Amino acid sequence: RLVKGYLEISQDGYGFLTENLHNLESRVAIVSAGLIKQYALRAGDYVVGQARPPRENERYATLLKVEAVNNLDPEAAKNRPRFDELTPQFPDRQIRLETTPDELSTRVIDLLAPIGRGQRGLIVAPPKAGKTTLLKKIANAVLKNEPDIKVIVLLIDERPEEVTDFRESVQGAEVIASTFDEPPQNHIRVAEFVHERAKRIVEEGGHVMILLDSITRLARANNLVTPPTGRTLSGGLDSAALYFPKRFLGAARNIRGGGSLTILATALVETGSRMDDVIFEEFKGTGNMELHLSRRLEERRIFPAIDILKSGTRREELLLGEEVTHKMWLLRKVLADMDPAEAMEMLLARLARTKNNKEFL
C-alpha cells in the first residue's frame, strides 16, 4: 500500500493518518515516538513505509520502517534544515495576474494589489459580500496564470452547497472544507493538520499557496473551542488561541533559500462585533497587504467592491523594480484622490478597454 497520509502525533507519542476527507478517519496508523527520534522528522511529513496487515486484537498497524519519506530516502529526513531557522525576506517573486474570464475584477486586483510569492495579505469585507466568490476568482486566476505553484484552499464553517459548488467548479484543486455543521473540534483539528503539513511542504523548499476562508469566523471557531479567553479580551477573543491563527498566519514569508509560502485569506468586518474589529486591527499590523471592501459598493452590485484607499501594500519597491516602483509611485500620486463610487464605475469602464499592460501602455 502507498500511504499518502500525514503524521498526527497524539499525546502518547503514537500517531494517526487521516484520509482524503482531510479529517480523522479509518486509515490512521500508529506512529511510534521511537521512529520520531530515529528519523529526526516533523509531524505532517509525507511518509511512505511498509505496513503489515493488522492482526487479532491488534488495532492500528505499526510502522516497521520508512522506506521513502517525502518521496525521499531516510538520510535526507535525518539531515534537513529546520523551518524556523530559515531567513525570511520580503517577497521578490511577484505573481502576475491576467485573466480573460474576468478581466475587470481580477485586473483591478492586479493593477491595484499586486501579489508576490510569500505574500501575507488580508482581504476584508462584511458578511454576505461574496468573499468566497472572490476567492474562487483568484483561485482560477492562479490556476491559469501560475499553474506551476501548488494551490490549496481551506474553507471553514461555511454553507455546504457553496462547498459543493466550489469543489465542482474548482476543477480538482486541493479544496479543504469544514462546514459549520461540523463540531468545532473537527474544525480546529483539520486546520492544524493542514498547518503542519503545509509547514512540512515549505520546509521541503516548496511554493505553497494556502487560501484560507474567513479568518475572522475561524477566530470565532477558535473561541468556541478555546474556553477561557483568560481575562476577556473585549467580547471573547483569546491570546493563546489567536496565537494559532497568529502562527498559522505569520508563517507566510519570503524565504531566500528557495520555495515560498504565500497564504491569503479574508476577514469579516463591520459586523457590529468589537471582536471582529479587534482581530482585524490585530492582524492588520501583521499582514503586509490589505484589501478593504466596501459594503455599499456590493449593494451597488459593483465588483470588486474594494475600499481602494484603505487598500495598499508594504515595500512597493520590493515587488516592483525602480522603474516600476516609480511608475507605481506616480500612479498612486494620481489615483490617491478621486472619489470612491465614481472611481468604481468609471474605472470599470476604463479597464474594460484592454489588457492591464495594454491599459498602462
Next chain:
Amino acid sequence: RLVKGYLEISQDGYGFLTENLHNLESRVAIVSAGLIKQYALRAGDYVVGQARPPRENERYATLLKVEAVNNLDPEAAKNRPRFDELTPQFPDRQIRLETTPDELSTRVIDLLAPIGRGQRGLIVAPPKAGKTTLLKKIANAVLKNEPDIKVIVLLIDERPEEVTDFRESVQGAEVIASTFDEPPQNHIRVAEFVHERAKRIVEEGGHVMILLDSITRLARANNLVTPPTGRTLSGGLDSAALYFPKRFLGAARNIRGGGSLTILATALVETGSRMDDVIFEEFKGTGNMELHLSRRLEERRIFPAIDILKSGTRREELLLGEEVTHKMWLLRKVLADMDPAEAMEMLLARLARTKNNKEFL
C-alpha cells in the same frame, strides 16, 4: 387498533406518538431502543402501527408492530439514504407569483426576491413591522401556485389571537404555534420537533415549504431559552446558543436528489439591543436571501413596507434562466437608482400598471 401520528422518541430509550395537537399529547405509543435499532427508525416519521393498551401499573400504550412509515412499508424504510450526505445544489425551481388579491406585493417579491424550491430566505424589520400578514399573503399565493408542496407554518412567541386568526385564515394549511405565554421549553420542543419531521419529509424527495414566524424573535426566545450555553458575547449572548438555531436554519437547502426544503422566516432587527442586531448579522451569513423593511415606510402605512435597496438574492442564474437572469440583469442595472420614498411610489405605480411579465410583455 390503529395508532397514528408522528414519532417522538423519548429520551429514556422508548418512544411516543404525537397527534395533530402539535404538542405533548397522551396518545403516545412506546418505541423501545431495540425497536429503534432493528427498524433503524427515526423519530418524527409518519407512523401508522398496531399497539396495545397500557397494562396494570403501566401508563402508556405499548407498540405491537409497525406497518406504515411515511406512508411506506418499513422494509423500504430500512433502505434509504440519510439526510446528511444528500447532495445540495442551489435552488432551480422558481415559483411564479401573480395573485389576484394583491398582485403588487407578490410582484415586488418576484422582481426583488425570486423564490425557488429549497431557498433559504429572510425578511428583517423591528417588532410590529409588516411581517405576519405578508407571510399570510405569500402562503396563500403558494397554496394556489404550488398546491403540491407540503406547506408548513410555525409560530413562536406571539399573541394567541394572531395564532387563531391565521389558523382559520390559512384555509386549513399546516399551522403550528407556540405563544409567548408558553414556557420556553415548549417553544424548543415544538420548534425542533417540526425541524425533524421536516427533515424526514424532505428525506423522501419531498418539497417542503416552512413558514417560520419570527426567526430573530425566535433568537430572543432562545436567549430566554438559553440557560447558559457558554461565554458572554456582546449584548448578552453566549457561545453555543446559536448552534441549535443555526443547525435549524441552515438545514434549508436545495437538494440534487429531488424534493426541496424552502424555509422563509421573519427577522426582528433595530431593537436597540446589541444581542438582537448581532444575531441579525450572524444569521445573515447563513441565509441566501434577506428582505429589509424600514420603519419610515410603515409609520407612513406604506405597504408593502419593503426596503428594496438592501434586498438581493444569491446566484440568480442558478435559479433563474440565462434569458431571465439577463433581463433581470438589465432591470437591476435600471432599478438600482431611484431614491427610497419616491422609489416606493413610482415602483408601486409601475407594477400597478401591468403584471411583471406583462410589464415585460
Next chain:
Amino acid sequence: EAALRDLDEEGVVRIGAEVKPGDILVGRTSFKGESEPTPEERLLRSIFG
C-alpha cells in the same frame, strides 16, 4: 462630438455651412477650475493620456 462634423478645422467652423440656433460656431475651451479643476475629469484624462 456628433455635431462637431460642421466644425472642420481647428476651432473655426467651415465656410458655407448652414447653422441653426444651438450649434457650435467656434470651439473655445477654458480651464475647468478657477484654482483647482475637477479631480474626477483631471484623473480621467491623466490615465487616458
